[PDB]
Amino acid sequence: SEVRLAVREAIHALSSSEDGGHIFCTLESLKRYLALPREKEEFASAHFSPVLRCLASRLSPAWLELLPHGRLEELWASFFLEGPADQAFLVLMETIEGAAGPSFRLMKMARLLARFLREGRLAVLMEAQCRQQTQPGFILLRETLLGKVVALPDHLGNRLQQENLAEFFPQNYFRLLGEEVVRVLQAVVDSLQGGLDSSVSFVSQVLGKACVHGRQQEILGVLVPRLAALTQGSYLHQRVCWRLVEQVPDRAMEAVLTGLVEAALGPEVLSRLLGNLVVKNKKAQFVMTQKLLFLQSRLTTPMLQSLLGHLAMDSQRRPLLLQVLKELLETWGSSSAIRHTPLPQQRHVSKAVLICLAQLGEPELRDSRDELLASMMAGVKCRLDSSLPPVRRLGMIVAEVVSARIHPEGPPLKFQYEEDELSLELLALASPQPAGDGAS
Amino acid sequence: XXXXXXXXXXXXXXXXXXXXXXXXXXXXXXXXXXXXXXXXXXXXXXXXXXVSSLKIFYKTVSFIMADEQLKRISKVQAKPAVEHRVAELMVYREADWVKKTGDKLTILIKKIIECVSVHPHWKVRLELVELVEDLLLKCSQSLVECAGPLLKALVGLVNDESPEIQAQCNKVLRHFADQKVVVGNKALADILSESLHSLATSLPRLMNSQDDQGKFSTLSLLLGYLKLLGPKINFVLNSVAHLQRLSKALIQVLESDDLNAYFRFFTDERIFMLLRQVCQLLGYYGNLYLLVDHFMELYHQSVVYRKQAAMILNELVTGAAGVEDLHEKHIKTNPEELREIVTSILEEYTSQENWTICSMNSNIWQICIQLEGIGQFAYALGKDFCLLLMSALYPVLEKAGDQTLLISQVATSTMMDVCRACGYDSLQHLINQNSDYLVNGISLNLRHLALHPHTPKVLEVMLRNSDANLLPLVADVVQDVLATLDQFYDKRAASFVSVLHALMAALAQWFPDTXXXXXXXXXXXXXXXXXXXXXXXXXXXXXXXXXXXXXXXXXXXXXXXXXXXXXXXXXXXXXXXXXXXXXXXXXXXXXXXXXXXXXXXXXXXXXXXXXXXXXXXXXXXXXXXXXXXXXXXXXXXXXXXXXXXXXXXXXXXXXXXXXXXXXXXXXXXXXXXXXXXXXXXXXXXXXXXX
């Protein structure tokens, strides 16, 4: 209670310096008590930031020598290295923004912040089981936490900034971030005290901004550790990783999925990590996966290979594969009907049609097949239009493919004897390997 | 013998109708004669036309013979034939309807008939009769088995919603297009309509780049054509070329004002066009996710394409609400998906909107359209806006600020909207509803989120507030707010906020109140402390207001308060500083002899100011406000004089100074009206009773 006055007295002593003994005693005493937390919260920030400012920006490079008995800088740091969780990082960032000089404590400030990160970087994540707060605060906190790299040399970018950032500028910092989210994930996993998802939610909000600017560092150096820490009977690990990939802020939901499928090992492990519902529970993910199917293509030879592979894998129990087949074929009939997209997307949706055509074995092989066959042949007839044979080429090859997997009896064999030897089926650009792929 | 030939033809048709062979096909030859004859009521007899293979061969002959038929229709389009229009139209209708069943290779005849129909499309509403005819013509044609020319025909069958009287016929026809005349499950008409709509949505970059009211024709064609595809647009949306072209088009049309419950901007100078456009974007309620996503993209893309996309998104969600009706065998969206979409769009809007004068009013347009968007979101999503109250409360409430008319008007409208949609009853009352959220939010903002101008939110929540029954909770935070720019007290955006909150608390405690005592005590304390600043008359204003409110039971606080205050004032006061004199007049509320001696020193100092109107009237009203027992100041005023005249402290001060008989001031110098000087009269009259 009365310590608040000491607090005043602290900032009094702190503002009435040159009294080496008094300041040493008051600072070491305050550190000693750095159960009621309310006044400890006002101390945790509303005394923390003033002492931080006035002891880092106000005092000249002579305080450290006022009492050089190896304790002044010690207590200086031990104020900012541990203690109150959140406001430390905040005031540190705000200062290093404001405190932008050539060098007064600049290098020492960097040493402070680094040595904080290096040991105990969680410091916020584990203490995320909070009730609720203001949203622009979250905004500033997370944006800083995820833009620190670029934020640093803005205030001072030079040879000194270079030697500061010639070992970990990128390629080590996000490596830290990834390591730390690994640690905190596994921590909240093995906790099993009370199901938080709060640290999970916060680190997902992290993953959000990380993905939307950081391009590809965390994918492998997360999933391979996630693969490992999930492969066992990992009830808590699997469930927490599910809830982590799930509640990713729907704002992006796309860079997350793009990276998560791009560098992933294979269809089985991708299907193991996401979750049976993560594609059939968050409709935004429906839209992401099947817009990647329809709209765009990124690498698509191994990439969409794996993506549709996981589509089928997950659909080991999802009767959603037939619906996506029908929609795919309908889009094929429309694109063959309407002034079409350029050839890249054409080959793209072609390969997609093939790979999804892999899975089969069911009733209804009466009418969907009729509409597909008729539309495709009627288009491919005139598709060349004395314009560009490749387009025509495309159709005829899927002709064989559809012939292979529409009703394998009778007339298709005639195709095998007519539209496979004297029907321009000679080029080897990308005809043979996808043809073989057609056999699932 | 013109009457003879007339009666002969008439009685011949009559004998036919009284009576009704391969060679009867030569009958059509006379129909050729009947096709270009004197034409009193000629074509009537033709009506004798109508396992029907005999009818089929007759129809072969009639397909060969419809040449003169179409020729006569074009003649009606050129020559008068002002009534035979319906005749020939029904003739062609019956003929072309008589044959599409089976075993009808007829591809040559098909192409010939398509040519003929394209020619006949040259008829459009000569009068009520021509429109009425073409209506049933399209009705019967499009309902036929299968062809490929109707791509043109059906087009005009949708744009026929522009007539003067027969509009009900076209509407009821489009109604009829439900299960028989379908977009439905006949891919041919669908793909032909898609091919049309593609060139359509590739033209509007140019079509609206010309004079007015001709664009309305094209946009109306567009809106109707979409109305055709009520459901089943995902069958044409899914193609990426479609979405790309349509989006890129619409981005340029919308980019000259707007109103509340959408209007476009430069180069769209008519308003009904804008209502039709917002009705056509609202037309999209087939699928949501694709649309909202592809348009959030266009928002994130650049700066010059933002406001357009914002207005788009507003129109799209409002359409997703649901107010007319289309083909009513389809399905509608879901409330939870609505929740997802609204959460996303609102989060992006809020986080993106918190801040070259051209660019300044550009940002003004940005924040305005985003506020209006929030309003529409409340309007459509009226009920389920309860899970996300605070997410909409905080942003615009903090935004309810500098721009009173535009920004704060749209704000107020949005808040009363969320009230009337969620039952919150006079948005001021919403502060009396859930408030601890606001309390803790403002607190933690000012406590950690320091470096950001969260200045006026406290003003909105305490000066424009409701009854102060919640200040007893706010007090400590108020106290904290007091200490806010009083612990470090080195920040411009914090000292300005301190002065602001000072004015606000002063006004509130003035009105709301009439605890508060010590509140005002520390208030005046900090205010007077900071008063030593530069260009801070707000300190004087707050001082005056508080002091006015602080004089009910101010036993000793006010005493030493005013002591130190007037001390610093005399230290400083040496042009609107007379407001402090008004504060002194406010001090005149309960001033005493201490204030008397203070005013005496004040008059002694002001004597240094010469005897030299605006300032004369200011000092006059200052003296006349209280005139606290002027004795030496009596002579000072004594050594035009409206105030000093109106003093009237006695009948001896100015009266002696009223012996001038001068030119100008003498007119008012002798203006004594009443004497009332009978004191000694009654004093002695006390000796006439007892």
Swiss-Prot record, chain A:
In the record, which positions carry Hydroxyproline? P363, P408, P411
Question: Which keywords does the record carry?
Answer: Acetylation, Chromosome, Cytoplasm, Disease variant, Hydroxylation, Intellectual disability, Membrane, Nucleus, Phosphoprotein, Telomere, Ubl conjugation
Q: Which domain of life is it from?
A: Eukaryota
Task: Report the locations given in the UniProt record.
Answer: Cytoplasm; Membrane; Nucleus; Chromosome, Telomere
Gene Ontology terms for molecular function? Hsp90 protein binding; molecular adaptor activity; protein kinase binding; protein-containing complex binding; telomeric DNA binding
| One GO-annotated biological process of the protein | 'de novo' cotranslational protein folding
Post-translational modification remark:
Hydroxylation by PHD3 is required for a proper interaction with ATR, and activation of the ATR/CHK1/p53 pathway following DNA damage.
A GO cellular component term found in this entry reads: cytosol
Record's function text: Regulator of the DNA damage response (DDR). Part of the TTT complex that is required to stabilize protein levels of the phosphatidylinositol 3-kinase-related protein kinase (PIKK) family proteins. The TTT complex is involved in the cellular resistance to DNA damage stresses, like ionizing radiation (IR), ultraviolet (UV) and mitomycin C (MMC). Together with the TTT complex and HSP90 may participate in the proper folding of newly synthesized PIKKs.
Q: Which disease is it linked to?
A: You-Hoover-Fong syndrome: A syndrome characterized by severe global developmental delay, intellectual disability, dysmorphic facial features, microcephaly, abnormal movements, congenital heart disease comprising developmental abnormalities of the great vessels, and abnormal auditory and visual function. The transmission pattern is consistent with autosomal recessive inheritance.
Q: Which family does it belong to?
A: Belongs to the TEL2 family.
**Subunit comment:** Component of the TTT complex composed of TELO2, TTI1 and TTI2. Interacts with ATM, ATR, MTOR, PRKDC, RUVBL2, TTI1, TTI2, SMG1 and TRRAP. Component of the mTORC1 and mTORC2 complexes. Interacts (phosphorylated form) with PIH1D1 which mediates interaction of TELO2 with the R2TP complex composed of RUVBL1, RUVBL2, PIH1D1, and RPAP3.
State any further remark: Cells overexpressing TELO2 are hypersensitive to hydroxyurea (HU) and undergo apoptotic death in response to treatment with HU.
Q: Please report the name of this protein according to its UniProt entry.
A: Telomere length regulation protein TEL2 homolog
The protein's organism comes out as Homo sapiens
Starting at the broadest rank, the lineage of the source organism is: Eukaryota, Metazoa, Chordata, Craniata, Vertebrata
Q: Which residues of the full protein are shown?
A: 6 to 451 of 837
From Swiss-Prot, chain B:
Its post-translational modification remark reads:
Phosphorylation by CK2 only takes place when TELO2 is bound to mTORC1, not mTORC2; leading to selective ubiquitination of mTORC1-associated protein.
**Effect seen on changing H242R:** In NEDMIM; uncertain significance
Impact of mutating S220P?
In NEDMIM; uncertain significance; results in altered mTORC1 activity
Q: Name one GO biological process term.
A: protein stabilization
What compartments host this protein? Cytoplasm
Q: In which tissues is it expressed?
A: Widely expressed.
Domain of life assignment = Eukaryota
Q: Which GO terms describe its cellular component?
A: cytoplasm; nucleus; TORC1 complex; TORC2 complex; TTT Hsp90 cochaperone complex
What are the alphabetically sorted keywords of the record?
Cytoplasm, Disease variant, Intellectual disability, Phosphoprotein, Ubl conjugation
Q: Which family does it belong to?
A: Belongs to the tti1 family.
Record note on quaternary structure: Component of the TTT complex composed of TELO2, TTI1 and TTI2. Interacts with ATM, ATR, MTOR, PRKDC, RUVBL1, SMG1, TELO2, TRRAP and TTI2. Component of the mTORC1 and mTORC2 complexes. Interacts with WAC; WAC positively regulates MTOR activity by promoting the assembly of the TTT complex and the RUVBL complex composed of RUVBL1 and RUVBL2 into the TTT-RUVBL complex which leads to the dimerization of the mTORC1 complex and its subsequent activation.
Q: Linked disorder?
A: Neurodevelopmental disorder with microcephaly and movement abnormalities: An autosomal recessive disorder characterized by global developmental delay, impaired intellectual development with language impairment ranging from delayed speech to non-verbal, and delayed walking with an abnormal gait. Affected individuals may show hypotonia or hypertonia with spasticity, ataxia, and choreoathetoid movements. Most patients have microcephaly, non-specific dysmorphic features and short stature. Additional variable features include ocular defects, seizures, brain malformations, and skeletal defects.
Q: What does this protein do?
A: Regulator of the DNA damage response (DDR). Part of the TTT complex that is required to stabilize protein levels of the phosphatidylinositol 3-kinase-related protein kinase (PIKK) family proteins. The TTT complex is involved in the cellular resistance to DNA damage stresses, like ionizing radiation (IR), ultraviolet (UV) and mitomycin C (MMC). Together with the TTT complex and HSP90 may participate in the proper folding of newly synthesized PIKKs.
Identify this protein by name. TELO2-interacting protein 1 homolog
Show which stretch of the intact protein is covered.
Answer: 166 to 1071 of 1089
